[PDB]
Homo-oligomer: 543 residues x 2
């Protein structure tokens, strides 16, 4: 049988032309080949996973195809047919990578939420039961769990809870005062509620992506200045209890991750660091100590808290450490190796193409944003209507991947005694690439009325597929089986100091939209942490 | 674009022929017309929210619905393949034709070749082994109540996505009692806050089970002392104590939930779990009169609990021909379910028969015979899915295929009778004619005979259910109207022996349920629109042989 999908004529024409240009195997590589054949898909699938996976996966080609089409329509409406055509061509041939493409015309990527609207209003967007604002710890924890479950299904990416412990403390104290618990059973009641939360957030084939952030004293003071709990108390008056509550959780998981063997929430510590020292050295020494066991907390370093006290400021990171009330509605990544391949070694041409493609990506992000707005107006994204997800606090994200491979193809990498590295010219070249992307991102605000950011994305699948497409198009000229999601590859034989220095040079140019992975005593570890923080690295972890 | 789905030639031929013979409209009615067009489907979906507001769902609903036409089409194809393998091409073609034109109704059709319909579980494996079919986190057997509750919740969520229908937990309170007592003994709770700790876990459980568009369908059963003693004779808790030694603790805990739910159902307005009380009733009286009077009392407020009446506990004793009640609304016995329901469109046969009852019965027998084969095919497919490791509920002994019926469903008994000229109106309201009652008897007895033969024919047990048919009642009527026009005057077919809305004396309604509930072994429900008054009426209904009923308010 053949089934009719009812596209506009011009889109049909476009897809026919692209098919003729690139062949069926490009489409197959893009996930628009056999994958759209339900019988093949189903019979192949049915040969760790169970049936629940099937119903999730079966529709992904189809909702991708619809999303591509819808984005094309909106781009045509906004900028004209040629632009829309060019974007579709770029997405299908792999010059760019639309993330969560099966969701791109239906819902947004991620957000790091505050729990205040929950505490104050409960969960009125759910009708199957009425949920009065909580008044005890058990209710609060339930509500939080349900909120996470609901948000994971209203979005494609991470659910961040950086101020979780702030609001948890309040219900701990309130419960304590009203004698719901015996004091001698406080810690048991706390750890119980940790267990309930942690257990519920590690349930399926894979768990939703959540983030916790250990806020230091500076961040707590800065974020919640003036703000009050429900009882009228000032939040800033309980900084030491909130800290105490966070440390308890951190200690608890390090013991418990052995036993119960869970991943989430992904843990980040946010520390204000200036002039060679931590402004909250206690918290820093605590995290440094805790991490000794598993190295399970990511180090977030900042030199300022102005961002967290219409152009958007605040850190956005797909792994963790996204600031409170910050996110991204969509990421679209630039294939930098493609551009290298298209440039033929000419760096001027490289930068002209880069610039042009980043400009296209902005137009697509704008179009996606308009579609999200359409979804909101259609009553489909209640997290917006209920002011939990804020569109004015979401970036459009320009992604980058394959910086190293791109530089390599340009002949700007080498190897000396200290292993693999960029050449001097290669460092200048990366400087220029990143400065160009920055320039365009910054122009974006005035151009389209919302803020753009940049991230060196994890690219778990993109790093493979973009490489495959480039190999398909450029053959032996593209030697890499996979593109890199760090400034210098994880597997690379290179001195740790170079790695660190690169991160110290380039992390700032993406405003912390990157991570550094670095593979006998506390003071040693802490000396290293300080050394890395001194060099300007904004987000890192040891393995 | 035109997208290829890779069917065998015979199936494509068949579908094209059916298309030529019935027209696109029938396919559109069946869910295989414009619904397969992702663009039309999506464009449609995103403005229903606009129409909603004009008249008076969110994006999470989109990803659920978009694939249903497609997984139904695959399921139909797969069932056709398996039926061709098992019984030959003519049968398979016949079944596909019947399914598409509305002679039968395949339930959960978008799931039918992928997972089973329903089960009423025991929580013993969860208590003893935890949730080892989940890998995202380790889940050792619970030691405390809070953990037990969490595990039950996650089990429900997990099982709800491994099946299409209800998740029944008949012995929930049996196992919850244990953890309550255990935490009381070890001083986890202060005695003086014991009731508070319990209600907190009633809250947690109940919140979570009413908290998705629509919540998973769950069932609770108040087991009377007879059921508890009969089911759990010889069984022990993890501490080695006999469960039967705790009958009065289990009862008290069950009454506590029923009381709390009644008080709380108003405040929070939730629906689940669906409450049934299972009561042993013999020769004019409740064998557990205490529990019956309690239920009677607590129902005075919302009538939120359904009455399950049985004359025997033999079936449920210890829990190869399968015995035990199966009901899609509530009251399925412990360790009972159905892997699939396929309903016979009885009005269709009325229309086909032209008024002749022997023709009617010949066609019916043939249809039920075909349905049996379809159910046998679906069963084999589920077994394939099990061997492919896709249905861990079976691998971990929570879902039991040998404890699952293949279900022959029925809908439109009344409308079928009316089309046949076998209904009327007398002084006590609408009713069957004398000949109509015999006709209904013959229908049910014929299905019964075929069901009983099926066991020898196919090696598993068949049951019968007068299904709720929330959608089938409309679609079947519509299709019949499309095929037969004004000879099918009903906008909707009925899911009770007598239409809920019909002006007919309660006594007749009761009488009909008393005549026919047993023929479908309790696969039906009777809705009927001071305390002693209520109790007397309950007893009057039970004496008449009604097996499952409720009052509406």
């Amino acid at each position: 049988m053949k089934v009719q999908y009812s596209f506009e004529r011009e889109f049909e024409e476009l897809m026919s032309d692209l098919l003729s240009k690139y062949g069926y195997e490009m489409f197959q590589m893009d996930g628009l080949g056999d994958q759209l054949d339900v019988v093949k898909f189903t019979e192949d699938f049915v040969r760790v996973t169970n049936i629940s996976t099937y119903f999730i996966e079966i529709s992904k080609p189809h909702t991708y195809l619809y999303s591509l089409y819808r984005i094309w329509q909106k781009m045509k409406e906004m900028f004209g047919k040629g632009v829309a055509d060019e974007f579709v061509e770029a997405q299908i041939n792999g010059a760019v990578y639309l993330h969560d493409r099966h969701h791109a015309a239906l819902m947004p990527y991620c957000f790091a939420y505050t729990l205040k609207p929950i505490v104050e209003k409960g969960l009125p967007f759910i009708k199957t039961i009425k949920s009065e604002p909580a008044k005890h710890l058990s209710t609060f924890i339930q509500h939080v769990i349900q909120f996470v479950m609901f948000a994971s299904n209203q979005s494609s990416g991470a659910v961040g809870l950086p101020d979780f412990f702030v609001w948890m403390w309040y219900f701990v104290k309130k419960d304590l005062k009203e004698g719901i618990i015996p004091r001698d059973k406080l810690d048991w009641y706390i750890e119980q509620h940790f267990q309930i939360l942690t257990y519920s957030l590690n349930q399926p084939t894979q768990s939703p992506y959540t983030n916790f952030t250990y806020l230091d004293r500076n961040y707590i003071k800065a974020i919640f200045e003036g703000e009050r709990y429900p009882d009228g108390s000032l939040i800033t008056d309980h900084v030491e209890d909130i800290i105490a509550l966070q440390k308890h959780y951190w200690e608890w998981v390090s013991r418990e991750r052995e036993r119960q063997m869970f991943t989430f929430p992904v843990l980040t510590a946010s520390l204000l660091y200036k002039d060679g020292k931590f402004l909250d050295e206690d918290s820093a020494r605590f995290i440094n100590k805790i991490n000794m066991k598993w190295q399970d907390t990511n180090w977030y370093i900042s030199d300022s808290i102005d961002a967290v006290a219409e152009k958007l400021k605040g850190r956005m990171n797909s792994i963790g450490g996204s600031d409170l009330n910050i996110g991204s509605f969509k990421v679209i990544t630039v294939n930098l190796p493609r551009i290298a391949l298209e440039s033929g070694g000419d760096r001027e041409k490289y930068l002209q193409i880069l610039r042009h493609r980043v400009q296209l990506i902005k137009k697509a992000l704008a179009a996606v944003r308009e579609i999200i707005k359409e979804r909101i107006s259609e009553g489909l994204l209640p997290l917006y209507e209920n002011g939990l997800m804020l569109l004015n606090r979401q970036y459009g994200t320009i992604g980058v991947t394959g910086v190293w491979e791109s530089a390599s193809i340009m002949g700007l990498t080498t190897e000396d005694i200290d292993g693999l590295k960029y050449t001097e010219e290669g460092e200048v070249f990366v400087d220029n690439v990143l400065d160009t992307i920055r320039e365009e991102a910054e122009k974006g605000y005035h151009e389209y009325g919302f803020t753009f950011n940049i991230e060196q994305v994890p690219a778990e699948k993109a790093a493979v597929t973009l490489a495959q497409k480039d190999r398909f198009l450029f053959g032996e000229k593209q030697p890499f089986e996979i593109y890199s999601n760090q400034w210098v590859p994880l597997m690379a034989n290179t001195d740790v100091l170079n790695r660190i220095r690169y991160s110290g040079k380039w992390d700032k140019k993406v405003s912390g939209g990157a991570i550094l992975h670095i593979n006998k005593t506390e003071e040693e570890s802490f000396n290293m942490v300080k050394m890395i923080a001194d060099m300007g690295v904004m987000y890192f972890a040891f393995n």
